Design a protein around this ligand. Sequence first.
Ligand SMILES: *CCCCCCC(=O)N(O)CCC(=O)O
Ligand SMILES: [Fe+3]
Lengths: 68, 11, 329
Amino acid sequence: QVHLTHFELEGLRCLVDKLESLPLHKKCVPTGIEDEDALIADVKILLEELASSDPKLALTGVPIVQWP
Amino acid sequence: APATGGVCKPH
Amino acid sequence: RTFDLEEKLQTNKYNANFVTFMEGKDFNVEYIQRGGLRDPLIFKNSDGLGIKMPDPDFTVNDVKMCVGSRRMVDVMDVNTQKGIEMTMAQWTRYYETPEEEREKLYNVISLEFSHTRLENMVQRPSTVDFIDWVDNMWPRHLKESQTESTNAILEMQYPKVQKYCLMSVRGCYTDFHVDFGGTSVWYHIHQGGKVFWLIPPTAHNLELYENWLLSGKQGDIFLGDRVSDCQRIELKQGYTFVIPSGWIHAVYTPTDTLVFGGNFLHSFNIPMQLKIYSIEDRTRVPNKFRYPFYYEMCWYVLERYVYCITNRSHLTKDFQKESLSMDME
Ligand SMILES: *CCCCCCC(=O)N(O)CCC(=O)O
Ligand SMILES: [Fe+3]
């Protein structure tokens, strides 16, 4: 239903792979984060479900992430 | 001396 | 420095065309979504960018009074490319000294002035606010809690890398580098002028760059000779320059100059951001010269994406509550 840019999809897969593969002493999980393993798991599911993003429809002129 | 971060300089 | 910087400024060989001249109105989120902020941009005027600058005759002594005579400032010794420290009042005295009376060439490129009186006198391009990870991803109650106006790491509640004042005397030179964390940079020539040599972040050029850093022979080798392609370009007074993640660049100051600029990470060139970070790690850059709280920020980025798309939060209850309270303001 949501459409990410391929820039973002590629980026987020790099990011997840990166953070997941760091050892504990370099992971730097911040104090606001609850369960970093469940967050990772969720990003992986999300990227599979968003893999068919339509590049046209993603060009909304508004970022996905904004404060309400 | 206190440690700093976000200092712009080459190398 | 055993290469002649004067011939690097005179030769016509750095003749690549990498920069796009743009009108401010076309620099929007749609443009970023479609292009990924991959191309260096110059805005010859500020129409449509949404910037604000101080008064056009603003002096270094004015900067000093806004941040404090006693603020410690990192200064670069141009001859060595090493850092020293002095007070802003001492920097001001050096800067107001006539050219012939200055013993050495020093440059200030790292004065971050958020949470000082100068902060509200400078506003960056609007589009940057929409995509900066600091503004859009970092827990807002942390950012708002910052009181320290220096870059003291124990006082820092967020990555304080958003607004820098650069003060450069004629003849200053900053050797080739990539901005910290793979940040993109906006850079506004308030007064004076700068000459940049720009080198694209191809896999080959980034290997050369790392190898050049690991060799320790940066005084001996002008990097812009060692690469495939390099654009030398002049920025004049009133121009605003945007430098994408990973671009290798060196800068010369032909006249006394004052610049306002700043750094941002964004969601459209993450792979390059990570790549730069890993060059810093391998070449052992001290944390002082790096993006603060880099991986922490990356965790928060993942959380925001998940939350905004699925409505499932991976923040602690207490951070959820802090965020909810702010949504209600
Ligand atoms: C990190 C501070 C914002 C960007 C300006 C410093 C810098 O990295 N430069 O490339 C400019 C160097 C200069 O003007 O001498
Ligand atoms: Fe730079």
